[PDB]
Structure formats: C-alpha cells, structure tokens
C-alpha cells in the first residue's frame, strides 16, 4: 500500500501544481496582443542554394557570426559552408554515416557529430596539421544521439536516445552531470542565451528545464499530445517555443511555464522538424513535413509567410546570431538560405 | 576577384570533385537492412565498440553489400526507421524452432507472436512501401525434432492440419506471406536455411539483383 500511497501523493501534488499554474494565469497573451499592429507578409526569397550534398540532410548549425555554417548528411560528409560566397570550406568525413545532429562551436574551433552510432565526435577544425582531425570520441550513451549543442570550447551537452541528457568534458571524455527524468525517448536540446540553463523535449510531450551546474530538472510542462522533436529559446531567455509531431507549435515561458500561445492551422496536418526564432523574437520559424517552411508571428499566432521551395520534407533550419538570414535544410540534399 | 577568393573557389571546386567521386561509389555500394527478433539466428547469418549499428562489409560477384544490424539500438524505433529510405532490401532472420517456448524465463507472450507483430510493423511502414523483404527461416535442423513431439497447437489453436515438417513449414510460409497488405508493389522472398547451410549469399544476390532490375526499369521510365 506504500506504492499506492506514493502514487496518490504524487497525483494530488501534481493536481496542486496544475491548480497553482491555472490560478497564476490572470490573463492570456491573445487579449494583450489584439491591440497592436500585425507583421506584414514575409516575402523571403531564396538567396543561396548550397548544392553539393549527395544524400539526405538532417542537421545544420550557424556560428556566432554569419558566413559560416556546418551541415551533416547520410553520405558520411560533414560539410562546412561559406554562406555568402556559396563555397564549402571543409568536407569532413565521418566514420559512421548515420548522423542526425551537428553543431558549430562558439569559438569556431570544433564541430559536433552524432547519431545512431551512439557516439559523439568532436573534430578540430584549426590544426597545424592541415586537415580536420577528430579530437575527442565521446562515448557513454546507450541510445542514439539527437542534439549536440556546444556550451563552450570545453563543455558539450548531448541529447541522446537513452532518455537522458549528459554534460561532458572534452579533455577527459566523461559525463560531468547526467540529466535524468525524461520517461520517453529524447530528441531535442537548446541552450539559453546567457549559458545558464537548457531545455529538452522528449516523447512524453514534456519539455524539462535543466540546470547545468548541479543537474536536476527545475521545471516542466506537458501541453503537447505527441512526440516533441524541436526546441529553441526565445532571444531573451525567458521563453521557449516547442515543435512536435502534432501539427502544432506551442510557446512556453521560463517564468510560469504554461501554454502562452499555440501555432496550429487546419491546412497543416504534418509534423514539425525544426523551430527557430529571429533575433528580435517577433518571427517564429518552424519546419514542416509539408515540404516547406512556415514563419509565425510569436505574438499574434498568425502566418506571416511561407518559405516554400524545397523538393522534400525539411529537417533543419537555423537563424544567424545577427538575424541576417535563415538556412533551411531539407531531405532533398539541398540547403537554401532565405533573406 | 581577389586571389584569396579565387583560390578558395578552386579549393571548393576540388573538394566538390572529391566528394562527387567519393559519392559515385555509393550507388555501387548496395545496402541491406538486417533486423529481427532477439536470438533468432541473426548472429549465425552474418558469417555468410560502438554499441549501435553493427557495420559488416561483404561482397558477392562484385556488388559490395552492406548490412546494418540494429540489434544494439534499444531506443524507440519510430524515430530512426526513416533513415533507411534508400535501402534496397530488408533481411528478416527469425527462427522456426522458437514457436513453442514463449520466453524461456517467463510466461506472457510467445516469440513467434512477437516476431509476427514485428514483421507486420516493419512491412506496413510508410517508409518501406517499395522495399522487398528477404525473409529467413533459419535453424531448420532444430525444427526437425521439435515438431515430432510438440505440435502447432501450442502456438496456434487454429491449425487443424497435419503434424509434419513440410505442412508446418508451408503454414508458417502462409502466415508470413499474408502479413503483406499490398502484394502489388511489394514482393517478399522467403528462404529455407539452416545454421550450417550454404546458398544464402546466392539468395540475397538474387534478391538484390531483382530489386536493382526494378530500379533500372524505374529510372528508364518503364516500371
């Protein structure tokens, strides 16, 4: 009867949390937003078509500036692109071609790679030996890796298939902290702009806020009803939007962690693969399985335009840190850049 | 423009050419997706530390097959099964001698029922509408003496036939063939083999050659 008593206590305390966050919402964001001017149509024509991949592209990531971005695909190539001149700087070979995540270090010195091989790979882009050489082979995850955003040059956070997130050290290869508490399979990760906290999404339709220095879930919320596979922070760090396989995008804040606004339309019944913000936070950019991309007003929940032009389902899109342009990758071995 | 920019463009063109000549051999490098139930003879089929996809490279009559054993991937299969659109075939190794015992440690579900459910899941995927299945029914040597004593009534209370080897093999054949919900664009290959039996590389060669005949009819614009 102890297990039943613990389950009843957990249920009543979760009901208390739900009642507290229900009474905490004195007003909704719609009735505050309904008296401001709307954003016009975002007629964002394509500018750069980074041809060169020979297989399906799953991940991309920008740098601290524009003009440099990395991409991963099942051809075993981790291509770093020169964005303005359409050039490619490096074509990094991969030991395992099963890749679905890649990231670019803020120092510009390292790149991440991982996937169904359950091993994170760190490559050294700047070396006296003239090549791209692997530096640290991060092992210790029993599931497939899905997101490998860089904290800094020495700390790396990995979202993996073992229903746990891990924070590693490059020089030792060991997990400093392990983030446990996700019941479902985990395929999302995004770090805060001030580099203090991070969020992660899983199959249980729950996005959990974690702390890096001590390693436990500070806050969570379940508003989705399907698998969550896209997460990113608002540029101020006090909100984050959620992308799922539910044909809806949902906005949660870091202060109350409730349903601020949903971004769903009747004409779209396809899942979301990637979600990113502009640097002002007014425009929310969401990938889709409808073979295109849609931009969303993060305040009015209105469609500000469609980034159509991809021959297949898009899988990765990122916005530059100066808000310059967005590079949407897709399954058609293309990487279009939109301004 | 600048000599820096011109040399950068030349370097980009050179690595484009290198990437093209490295990816042109990926069409020749044909790929296979091997999966099935646990301890179903999958370990003895591959003879003819990442803790993930086991990569085995073998060739037969200059075709360069690749097998992707996903037996070490215990995560949710729905979120990584879409990485195998371009695979040419699926190898499904299941054991005929695993019909009467359910787990050999507990009593909740038969291994053959779980194998049937896994085959129905992997055959009716929306990613494998046109991906042929090379079904393997191995360890027939252990199935010879395991059928004279224990009939099919333990596994199926609907058989009502003859307790013999050939009719049992044909009935398992009929069960596995009816799991295909669309026989027009999908063709399932089943081979009878043992743990110490040859003529499996010939069977997979015949399967892959038939699928690439279908592909060469497809790109020419006929099929």
């Amino acid at each position: 009867s102890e297990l039943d008593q613990l389950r009843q206590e957990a249920e009543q305390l979760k009901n208390q949390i739900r009642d507290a966050r229900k009474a905490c919402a004195d007003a909704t964001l719609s009735q505050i937003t309904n008296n401001i001017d709307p954003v016009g149509r975002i007629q964002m024509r394509t500018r750069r078509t980074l041809r060169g991949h020979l297989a399906k592209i799953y991940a991309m990531h920008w740098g601290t500036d524009s003009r440099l971005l990395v991409s991963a695909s099942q051809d075993g190539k981790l291509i770093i692109w020169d964005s303005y001149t359409t050039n490619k700087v490096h074509a990094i070979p991969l030991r395992s071609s099963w890749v679905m995540t890649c990231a670019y270090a803020p120092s510009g010195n390292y790149v991440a790679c991982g996937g169904l091989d359950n091993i994170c790979s760190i490559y050294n882009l700047k070396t006296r030996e003239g090549n791209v050489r692997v530096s640290r082979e991060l092992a210790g995850h029993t599931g497939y890796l899905s997101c490998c955003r860089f904290l800094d040059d020495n700390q790396i956070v990995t979202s993996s298939g073992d229903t746990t997130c891990a924070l590693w050290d490059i020089e030792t290869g060991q997990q400093t902290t392990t983030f446990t508490g996700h019941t479902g399979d985990v395929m999302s990760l995004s770090l805060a702009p001030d580099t203090r906290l991070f969020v992660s999404g899983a199959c249980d339709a729950s996005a959990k806020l974690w702390d890096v220095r001590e390693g436990m879930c500070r806050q969570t919320f379940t508003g989705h009803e399907s698998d969550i596979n896209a997460i990113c922070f608002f540029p101020n760090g006090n909100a984050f939007a959620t992308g799922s396989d539910d044909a809806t995008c949902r906005l949660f804040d870091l202060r109350a962690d409730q349903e601020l606004m949903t971004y769903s339309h009747d004409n779209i019944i396809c899942g979301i693969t990637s979600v990113s913000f502009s640097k002002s936070g007014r425009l929310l950019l969401a990938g889709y399985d409808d073979f295109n991309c849609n931009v969303w007003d993060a305040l009015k929940a209105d469609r500000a335009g469609v980034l159509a032009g991809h021959d297949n389902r898009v899988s990765c899109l990122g916005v530059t840190d100066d808000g310059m342009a967005v590079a949407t990758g897709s399954w058609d071995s293309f990487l279009k850049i939109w301004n | 423009l600048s000599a820096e920019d011109k040399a950068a463009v030349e370097r980009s063109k050179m690595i484009d050419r290198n990437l093209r000549e490295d990816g042109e051999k990926a069409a020749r490098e044909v790929k296979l997706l091997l999966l099935g139930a646990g301890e179903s003879g999958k370990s003895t089929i591959v003879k003819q530390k990442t803790t993930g996809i086991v990569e085995t490279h073998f060739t037969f009559k200059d075709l360069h097959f690749k097998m992707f054993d996903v037996g070490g991937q215990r995560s949710e299969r729905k979120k990584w099964i879409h990485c195998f659109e371009g695979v040419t075939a699926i190898i499904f190794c299941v054991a005929l001698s695993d019909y009467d015992l359910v787990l050999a440690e507990d009593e909740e579900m038969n291994r053959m029922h779980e194998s049937m459910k896994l085959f129905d899941s992997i055959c009716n995927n929306k990613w494998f509408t046109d991906t042929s299945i090379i079904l393997f029914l191995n360890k027939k040597d252990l199935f010879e003496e395991k059928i004279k004593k224990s009939p099919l009534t333990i596994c199926y209370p609907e058989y009502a036939g003859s307790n013999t080897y050939e009719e049992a093999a044909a009935y398992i054949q009929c069960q596995f063939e009816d799991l295909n919900k669309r026989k027009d664009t999908k063709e399932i290959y089943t081979h009878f083999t043992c743990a110490t039996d040859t003529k499996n590389v010939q069977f997979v060669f015949d399967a892959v050659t038939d699928v690439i005949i279908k592909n060469n009819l497809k790109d020419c614009g006929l099929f």
């Epitope: 020169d82 003239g130 | 600048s2 820096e4 030349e10 050179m14």
Partner: single-chain antibody
Framework: VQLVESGGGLVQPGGSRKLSCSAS????????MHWVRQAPEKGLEWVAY????????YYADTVKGRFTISRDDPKNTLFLQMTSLRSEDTAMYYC??????????????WGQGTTLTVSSSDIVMTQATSSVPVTPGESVSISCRSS???????????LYWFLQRPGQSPQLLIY???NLASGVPDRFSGSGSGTAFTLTISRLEAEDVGVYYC?????????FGAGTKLEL
C-alpha cells in the same frame, strides 16, 4: 610541420639545377606552395606559386617562362626546375606553404632555405624607414606603403607581415590586417587602412630583433617590401 630543403650550391651561368623541397609532418596535398628568394644583401621577392592539386600556377615577371614549379602529392615533396640561371638568380630559396579559405592564414610556414650561387603594373610595397634604433621594453611602430589600395569589395585588407630573425627563416605574424597569426604573442598590433599600413609592438623583447617585411596578396606577383632592421 617543418619543411626540409635540398639541392642548391655552385652552378655555372646558363645551367640548370633540380631544386626540390621535401615536406613532412603535414598534409601536403591541401597546401598551395610557393618559392620565395632572398639575395645575400637584399630582401625577399616572390618567385612561383603552385596551387592545391597543381590547378593554378603563377610566376613573377622575371621568371615567367624561365622557371618551372612542380609538386608530387603522393610522394610528399615539392620541386622547382630552374632553367638558364644567371647572376641575378643568386639568392636564398625559401619554401612557403599556404591554404586559402575563409579565416585561413596563408604563408604560415617557411622552410629553412637553401642557397644558390651563380658566378659572374605590379603593386609595389615600399618600407620608407630602415634600421631604426630600439630598446627592450619600449614600443616601436614601423610602417610600409603601397602603390595601390589593398581593400577589395569583400571588405578585408590584404597585408602580410614577416619577421626574419638573424639566421632564421621568415615567420608570419600578421597574415591579414588586424589579424594575429597562431603562435605569435599577443603584442603585435598590425593596423593601417587604405594606402598606409603599420605594425606595432607593445613591449619589445630580445628575440624580437631582426628584419621585417610586408607582403601584399591582392594580385600577382606577390612582391615584398624593403628591409626594416632593428638595432639595439
């Protein structure tokens, strides 16, 4: 990462010598190589340039059609065929490696060099000053001029600074303007916009003595400046 020289020596005028350089410790196939001379009493001047994969070959106006540069990527070596040598070809031949992409540092390594003795328009760079007095712990700002603007539409300024210690190869310090090379201590503040460019040392050291050269990489030939020695 070090370059090993071979060949050279005494040759009759009008003859030939198979000048070669054997690379080691780095990926030779991805580096665009060079050859840079240095007369026994004068400064540096660019001779030839072979790109990655031998796809682009350039020479100076004085060696156009007279010298042949070749590379062996599988054999990991670099050659230079010198035809009809004269007394104006008596210099010290250096081998220089470079890769050109975004953020790369060309001219980042120089060989030890080999000697060749023979018996008896272009954007010029001028170093107006030469052999300045200097003291340790002080700050000196040497400058060199150009005959043309060295800033294209891409926005970056193409100035290459080299320090040559006595008895040592030239060492890259400032590969592009306001950019510091790897392994160089963070006290060399290269600057200059438009026509005039300069190098600044915050605190001089004993190992900082030598002769400085500024090189432009905007067109060809990659002609150098004069010498700017340091006298204690």
């Amino acid at each position: 990462v070090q370059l090993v020289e071979s060949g050279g020596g005494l040759v009759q005028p009008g003859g030939s010598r198979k000048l070669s350089c054997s690379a080691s410790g780095f990926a030779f196939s991805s580096f665009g190589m060079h050859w840079v001379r240095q007369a026994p009493e004068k400064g540096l001047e660019w001779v030839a340039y072979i790109s990655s994969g031998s796809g682009t070959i350039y020479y100076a106006d004085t060696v156009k059609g007279r010298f042949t540069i070749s590379r062996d990527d599988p054999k990991n070596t670099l050659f230079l065929q010198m035809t009809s040598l004269r007394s104006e070809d008596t210099a010290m031949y250096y081998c220089v490696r470079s890769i050109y992409y975004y953020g790369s540092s060309p001219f980042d390594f120089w060989g030890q060099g080999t000697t060749l003795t023979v018996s008896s328009s272009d954007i010029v760079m001028t170093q107006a000053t030469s052999s300045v007095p200097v003291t340790p712990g002080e700050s000196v700002s040497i400058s060199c001029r150009s005959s043309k603007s060295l800033l294209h539409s891409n926005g970056n300024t193409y100035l290459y600074w080299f320090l040559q210690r006595p008895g040592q190869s030239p060492q890259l310090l400032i590969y592009r303007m306001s950019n510091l090379a790897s392994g160089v201590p963070d006290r060399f503040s290269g600057s200059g916009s438009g026509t005039a460019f300069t190098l600044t040392i915050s605190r001089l050291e004993a190992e900082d003595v030598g002769v400085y050269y500024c090189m432009q990489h905007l067109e060809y030939p990659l002609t150098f400046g004069a010498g700017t020695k340091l006298e204690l």
